[PDB]
Amino acid sequence: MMEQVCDVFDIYAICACCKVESKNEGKKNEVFNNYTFRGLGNKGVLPWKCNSLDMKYFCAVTTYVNESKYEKLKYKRCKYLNKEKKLQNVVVMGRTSWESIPKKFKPLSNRINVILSRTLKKEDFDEDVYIINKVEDLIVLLGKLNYYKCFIIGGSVVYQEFLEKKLIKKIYFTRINSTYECDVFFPEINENEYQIISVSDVYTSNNTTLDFIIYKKTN
């Protein structure tokens, strides 16, 4: 059948959402649901400060590669596009997101960094990164690159547009079980387009419990 772009190019999303300060629905008799966790950022940075464990998780997922699986992936993408070291993953982020990262981490290590922007061009960056002004360009770029998996580390605006177009094969979602002030949020996942298939162990880090759940695009 008509293979989906997100499937051919293994394009996933990964994020961490905390609970929003919905003033006064806050005391009991409050209803909870998956959308309870939607707080992504505040003031161009993270609502909660930094979460060590969440970070360990982020780096672990976005840098992990399986060399023995590439050949299979190469063949897939080639056949798709009508064709015939150190494998790396690709991370795609919005410009705002790229700037909110401390210089010491830019560009994200052991990862092919791709930034989405209209106000900036390659001449405005000093780092080893790819710049693109259209989502369609990411696809062209992916078709030309050697990589394992592609991760949309987002920016709320980025997450939003990649979900509408159905470019996400799975969502690695981190539920920060605490509340902070926020100004940007993750889109409300439609229980019909995506369904949770895995829920991890629960942990404590930086004074808050959290877990990791994996959403998957339904058939």
Binding site: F32, S198, T208
Partner: protein, 325 residues
């Protein structure tokens, strides 16, 4: 891949999925079975519910309701990582905390709990209940030599719920707190409520037989043995109850809580709870909340309701395990 086939052979004696007992319908747990990885700790609880429905034995019981049952299960909860208050349904802890403080004081007076609007023991203290237990000379709500009495006065002769049992009987609690404090490697740190001699004098025998503690690297772990476990109504609270108890003991002994281990003996599911559990098993767990204890409390006896705070409890909606309307 040669191992692959040997695995298949080694299962030559696992017969057909028809003699899998209790005619269970898959469709009732689609969401539950769809899940690939179920690592959230709440699944230790849910998985048992599933096992008991799918492989449980049909038995009758002291009540007549009829239950499905299995024997011998174990759950482990990491209190240094979270507070295990189930999320697939709503739970309140005010009651079980008042009950716990009530145990610690060695009380056996049900009125004390009822005056705090905690009815956990109300049914076990009525004239009828007491009389059916043959405790004709027992005043209404005088529960008898139960938990509290055994924890502070094991061995002492029970008179009534108003008596003063000071320096009478063995004060186990006091004893275990001393053992953890001064002899942390002791393999004799147990709290026992199953006083064989006083069983018939109790409103009813205790379900939580004993607790054993373990201390290592400044961390306290607890194992509690439950003889009779009501997966639908009881267990959720039992888990919470002892997790809180482990925190308290851990604190007054200058240690950090670690593992709370729950050993289930007769683990049963009341037939009249099945529909509600089906519903529940299809709900995905939310991350557990946390428990905060006033740190200034240094004595196990100085705790009060306001010294306990549960934070960030995200849970599905309330469920009556016995739905009618």
């Amino acid at each position: 891949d040669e191992e692959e086939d040997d695995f298949v052979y080694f299962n030559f004696n696992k017969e057909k999925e028809e003699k899998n007992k209790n005619s269970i319908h898959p469709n009732d747990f689609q969401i539950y079975n769809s899940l690939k990885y179920k690592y959230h700790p709440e699944y230790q609880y849910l998985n048992i519910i599933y096992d008991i429905m799918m492989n449980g034995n049909k038995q009758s019981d002291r009540t007549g309701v009829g239950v499905l049952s299995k024997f011998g299960y174990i759950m482990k909860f990491d209190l240094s990582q979270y507070f295990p208050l189930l999320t697939t349904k709503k739970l309140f802890l005010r009651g079980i905390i008042e009950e716990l403080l009530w145990f610690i004081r060695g009380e056996t007076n049900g009125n004390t709990l009822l005056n705090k609007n905690v009815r956990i023991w109300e049914a076990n203290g009525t004239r009828e209940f007491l009389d059916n237990r043959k405790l004709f000379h027992r005043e209404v709500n005088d529960l008898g030599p139960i938990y509290g009495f055994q924890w502070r006065h094991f061995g002492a002769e029970y008179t009534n719920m108003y008596d003063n049992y000071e320096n009478k009987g063995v004060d186990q609690l006091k004893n275990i707190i001393n053992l953890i404090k001064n002899d942390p490697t002791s393999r004799r740190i147990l709290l026992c409520a199953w006083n064989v001699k006083d069983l018939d004098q109790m409103a009813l025998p205790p379900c939580h037989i004993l607790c054993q503690f373990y201390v290592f690297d400044g961390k306290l772990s607890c194992i509690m043995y439950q003889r009779s476990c009501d997966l639908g109504l009881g267990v959720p609270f039992n888990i919470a109850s002892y997790s809180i108890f482990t925190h308290m003991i851990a604190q007054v002994c200058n240690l950090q809580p670690a593992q709370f281990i729950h050993v289930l003996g007769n683990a049963h599911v009341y037939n009249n709870h099945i529909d509600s559990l089906k519903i529940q098993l299809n709900r995905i767990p939310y991350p557990f909340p946390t428990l905060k204890l006033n740190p200034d409390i240094k004595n196990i006896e100085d705790f009060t309701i306001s010294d306990f705070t549960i934070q960030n409890y995200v849970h599905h909606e309330k469920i009556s395990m016995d739905m009618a309307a």
